[PDB]
Amino acid sequence: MIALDGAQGEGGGQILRSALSLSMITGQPFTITSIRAGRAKPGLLRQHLTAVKAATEICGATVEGAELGSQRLLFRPGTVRGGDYRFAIGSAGSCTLVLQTVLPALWFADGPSRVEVSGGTDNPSAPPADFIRRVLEPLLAKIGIHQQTTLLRHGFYPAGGGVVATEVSPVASFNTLQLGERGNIVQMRGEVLLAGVPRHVAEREIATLAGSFSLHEQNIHNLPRDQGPGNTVSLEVESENITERFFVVGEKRVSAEVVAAQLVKEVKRYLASTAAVGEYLADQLVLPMALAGAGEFTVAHPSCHLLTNIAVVERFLPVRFSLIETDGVTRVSI
Amino acid sequence: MIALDGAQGEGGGQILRSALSLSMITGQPFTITSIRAGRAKPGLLRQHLTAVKAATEICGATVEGAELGSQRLLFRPGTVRGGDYRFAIGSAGSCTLVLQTVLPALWFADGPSRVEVSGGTDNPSAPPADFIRRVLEPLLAKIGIHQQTTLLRHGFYPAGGGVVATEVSPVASFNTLQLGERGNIVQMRGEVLLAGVPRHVAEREIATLAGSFSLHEQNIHNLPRDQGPGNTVSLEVESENITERFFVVGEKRVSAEVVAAQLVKEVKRYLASTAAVGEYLADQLVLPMALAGAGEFTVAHPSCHLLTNIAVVERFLPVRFSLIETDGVTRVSIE
Ligand SMILES: OSC[C@@H](O)[C@H](O)CS
């Protein structure tokens, strides 16, 4: 029984989701207190409750404290099972966050699984569901993890409606991933996703990307208007050792040029370091690498989220992380 | 103009307080948006406003957005002035947070200064005002920074009422401070402060510390009932190369033994690693070494607070921190 203080690091939902995952994998139960204690609406909100129930269902846990506003939670996992799971988060609800809770555990399930989640997929506060398939999965495959995500329908905040489905197989063995240098840029590509939003908005965004970067491809993907309004712009940087993809989800009163220019600045900050992975992808490689007992990547700067994922992993798993930050590059390794 | 998002890293008052200090010292103005945006009560609160106000008063600043609830502030410092100031936070408000906002700028003031603040000195959520003289100041003195704090009266949470006074002289020259290893134990000293709490409670507390450590001294300090109720227990670990002091502020209905065991726990934690400084103290040396331009320390683990301080510092000052975390300890060095 691990006792977690939910007020470590940035002190929000990340602590809870990472522990839920690690509890399921390791079978170690846990209690967490001060869940989001300083936030406007403190304790477990409806989205956290959704994540806890999904976890509960895939491993038959026994739970105490799973109620709105609760600041305490006790989770005692059972055996992780395979099979066809369908969850509904709806609302703002990020698909991504349910998936990040349950996917790692399903890697240890007793058989293959399929996880369907309906809810938001594209929201300006966080990387879209599309980041799983396009950036995360190919690095999971090299670690020896079998996970294939399909966006079946986008749900653009504030609208829900999106549909994501991931197929997963139990891992046989973990490989050691070693990322240091990106390597030379092989190609960049820009894509605009549109649903119920005029075409010219994608032509302008694509032209702002094209003003700064040489693009191998300039794609405009139009979705059915029933999924809109929505606009997402992404830029892929395929280097010799890694493929990264950066995303800006467009907001209601923001213009095309401002959405695009935020994307351009994020890409130039990645290119300005020699680090192989961006901040957010760095947070997601922590667990799979912990799980393999070895591996490394470079990230520009350690972040609070990186520290917190590392701390929660180290409570459940006997691995230790080293962090050697020295020349505008931080090497993260087992 | 330096633009800061106040939602980075930890997302709270710390970012604001360090940018105030750094803007004053260097003369660089800044704006900060999304001040405390995720919090229960977001943006500028009373305590934050008291800190912007004291800062505006020591340097004659041009300020926009200094209001309750604002999530945006713009601050354009004038010349830091030496003089004698008095700030009242009252409430529970901690004197340390005002002090930590103006003292560093006063090291670059055009003459000596004296800061007096009134408000809370001893609260369960943070090291007492007493940490400044007992811990930090000897260290600032080796960095070439001359300041001396006095506890004139204690204000124990949830009451204010305490008074702290600091004297500062502008720095003439910075020095490189290098902390590696703690070195060997030299002595350990226990102390309990009481205000309107039976002496038996202090005795119990010293006797629990005495149960885990060899105490070279064991003082008990009774304050007038005036300043209570309150009870602060502390334990100093003087090693050859560094001295630390860890404190607990006893909470309303919490046993003597439970107060003291919390304190034994933080001390054994610090002694479970070979780092020279605990997390809190490492957070305090970032700015002063950045200003000297060179320096290093070891801390067991990097925390969010430490990262936040280093990133605000590197936005204003032409320095870069390196973090080498390897065998249970992190070396933090500035270049
Ligand atoms: O834990 S010691 C007790 C003393 O500090 C008072 O009860 C504070 S309100």
Please tell me the distance from the alpha carbon of residue A282 to that of residue A300, in angstroms, as a whole number: 10
Residues of B with CB under 8 A from a CB of A: 9-12, 38-40, 42, 302-304, 307-308, 311, 320, 322-326, 330
Q: Is B3 in the pocket of ligand 1 (CB under 6 A)?
A: no
Measure CA of the first residue to CA of the last residue in chain A; give whole Å.
Answer: 24
Residue nearest to atom 8 of ligand 1 (CA): B252
Exposed/middle/buried for A234, CB within 10 Å: 0-12, 13-18, 19+? buried
* Structure tokens that stand for A327 in this block: 């020349």
Please tell me the distance from the alpha carbon of residue B43 to that of residue B47, in angstroms, as a whole number: 11
* Structure tokens that stand for B128 in this block: 């007492």
Among candidate residues B253, B272, B291, the one where a domain is terminated: B272
Supply the DSSP string of A54-66, one letter for each residue: HHHHHHT-EEE--
Asked if A66 and A135 sit in the same domain, the reply is yes
Distance from residue B121's CA to the centre of ligand 1 (Å): 14
Quoted resolution (Å)? 2.1
Q: Is B176 left (phi over 0), alpha (psi -120 to 50) or beta?
A: beta
Q: Which of B154, B251, B255, when mutated, tests ligand 1's pocket best, judged by the most ligand atoms within 8 Å of its CB?
A: B251
Asked if A128 and A54 sit in the same domain, the reply is yes
Structural domain containing residue B190: 182-272
Please tell me the distance from the alpha carbon of residue B297 to that of residue B181, in angstroms, as a whole number: 8
Exposed/middle/buried for A168, CB within 10 Å: 0-12, 13-18, 19+? buried
Residue with tokens 């590509």: A189
Q: What counts of helices (H) and strands (E) characterise chain A?
A: 9, 16
Q: Mind telling me how many Å the CA of B36 is from chain A's nearest CA? A: 10
Solving technique for this entry? X-ray
Asked if B267 and B278 sit in the same domain, the reply is no
Asked if A40 and A89 sit in the same domain, the reply is yes
CB atoms closer than 10 angstroms to residue B286: 25
Any idea what DSSP says for residue A318? S
Exposed/middle/buried for B217, CB within 10 Å: 0-12, 13-18, 19+? exposed
Torsion of CA B190, B248, B21, B88, to 10 degrees: -100
Query: What backbone torsions phi and psi does residue A90 show, to the nearest 5 degrees?
Result: 60, -120
Q: Which residues in chain A have Cβ-Cβ distances shorter than 8 Å to B307?
A: 302-304, 307
Please tell me the distance from the alpha carbon of residue B255 to that of residue B324, in angstroms, as a whole number: 40
CB contact under 8 A, B324 and A328: no
Distance from residue B250's CA to the centre of ligand 1 (Å): 5
Please tell me the distance from the alpha carbon of residue B105 to that of residue B100, in angstroms, as a whole number: 9
Please tell me the distance from the alpha carbon of residue A250 to that of residue A229, in angstroms, as a whole number: 10
Of B10, B39, B302, the CB nearest to A302: B302
Handedness of CA B320, A305, B15, B142 (dihedral sign): negative
Supply the angle between the helices B13-26 and B304-316 in degrees, to the nearest 10: 30
Spell out the residues 6+ positions from residue A320 whose beta carbon is closer than 8 angstroms to its own.
Answer: A314, A334
Asked if A256 and A122 sit in the same domain, the reply is no
Mapped onto helix, strand or coil, the DSSP state of residue A209 is helix
Q: Is B138 in the pocket of ligand 1 (CB under 6 A)?
A: no
Task: Tell me how many degrees the CA angle B217-B222-B226 measures, rounded to the nearest 5.
Answer: 155
Asked if A104 and A166 sit in the same domain, the reply is yes
CB atoms closer than 10 angstroms to residue B244: 21
Asked if B277 and B132 sit in the same domain, the reply is yes
Mapped onto helix, strand or coil, the DSSP state of residue A186 is strand
Mapped onto helix, strand or coil, the DSSP state of residue B201 is helix
Please tell me the distance from the alpha carbon of residue B167 to that of residue A292, in angstroms, as a whole number: 55
Q: What residues pair up with A33 in beta bridges, in sequence order? A: A5
Exposed/middle/buried for A272, CB within 10 Å: 0-12, 13-18, 19+? exposed
Please tell me the distance from the alpha carbon of residue A173 to that of residue B24, in angstroms, as a whole number: 56
What domain count does chain A have?
A: 2
Asked if A194 and A230 sit in the same domain, the reply is yes
Residue with tokens 């713009």: B74
Q: Is B6 in the pocket of ligand 1 (CB under 6 A)?
A: no
Asked if B253 and B289 sit in the same domain, the reply is no
Asked if A24 and A127 sit in the same domain, the reply is yes
Q: What residues pair up with B296 in beta bridges, in sequence order? A: B178, B333
Residue with tokens 């799971």: A85
Among candidate residues A272, A297, A324, the one where a domain is terminated: A272
Q: What counts of helices (H) and strands (E) characterise chain B?
A: 9, 16
Query: What backbone torsions phi and psi does residue B280 show, to the nearest 5 degrees?
Result: -55, -50
Among candidate residues A231, A257, A272, the one where a domain is terminated: A272
Spell out the residues 6+ positions from residue B187 whose beta carbon is closer than 8 angstroms to its own.
Answer: B216, B217, B238
Please tell me the distance from the alpha carbon of residue A235 to that of residue A237, in angstroms, as a whole number: 7
Q: What is the bridge-based pairing of β-strands A162-169 and B185-195?
A: unpaired
Q: Would you say A180 and A298 are in contact if contact means Cβ atoms under 8 Å apart?
A: yes
A319: domain CATH number? 3.65.10.20
B200 is catalytic: no
Of B311, B320, B325, the CB nearest to A322: B325
Please tell me the distance from the alpha carbon of residue A10 to that of residue B172, in angstroms, as a whole number: 38
Please tell me the distance from the alpha carbon of residue B134 to that of residue A167, in angstroms, as a whole number: 59
Asked if B169 and B204 sit in the same domain, the reply is no
Residue with tokens 């200090």: B21
Asked if A115 and A205 sit in the same domain, the reply is no
